[PDB]
Design a protein around this ligand. Structure first.
Ligand code: HEM
Length: 119
């Protein structure tokens, strides 16, 4: 089930960016591949993201890995949107890499908001 998929290294730098992720976030694969993953989210998360990763690497206490969470992401044109995020942990060449699977929930949030406003 291809949804948006992103692989980052232990520093948050993007290694691979699926074509579905390009459609969702507005960045091409080439544009994203050397950027920090924090470019896909707004503040306060953006500036705090590196410490989320560092805190996990030092403690081994997952807050989203193996749990899943609904959050707000940011597209290249500046628009934000709700998405579900799941994180997988992997190893390659001795170093940790993390895989993120994203499911866009904009439609769901809208329908729900629509049903609510019509009482
Ligand atoms: C794009 C919107 C995203 C947002 C808003 C977001 C937000 C967060 C938040 C809020 C935390 C945990 C903070 C906590 O509960 O203390 C976190 C942890 C983490 N995120 Fe992100 N993240 C995003 C995408 C990603 C992606 C795509 C990846 C992997 C490709 C990723 C990799 C990680 C890792 C490895 C951790 C540390 C894990 C642990 O606490 O489980 N994040 N992120």
């Amino acid at each position: 089930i291809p949804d948006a998929m992103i692989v980052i290294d232990g520093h948050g730098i993007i290694q691979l960016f699926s074509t579905a992720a390009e459609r969702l976030f507005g960045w091409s694969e080439l544009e994203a591949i050397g950027q920090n993953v924090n470019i896909l989210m707004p503040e306060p998360d953006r500036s705090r993201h590196d410490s989320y990763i560092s805190r996990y690497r030092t403690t081994s206490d997952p807050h989203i890995i193996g749990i899943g969470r609904i959050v707000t992401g940011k597209r290249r044109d500046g628009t934000t949107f709700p998405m579900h995020l799941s994180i997988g942990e992997m190893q390659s060449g001795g170093e940790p890499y993390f895989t993120g699977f994203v499911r866009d929930l904009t439609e769901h949030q809208q329908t729900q908001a629509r049903l609510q406003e019509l009482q």
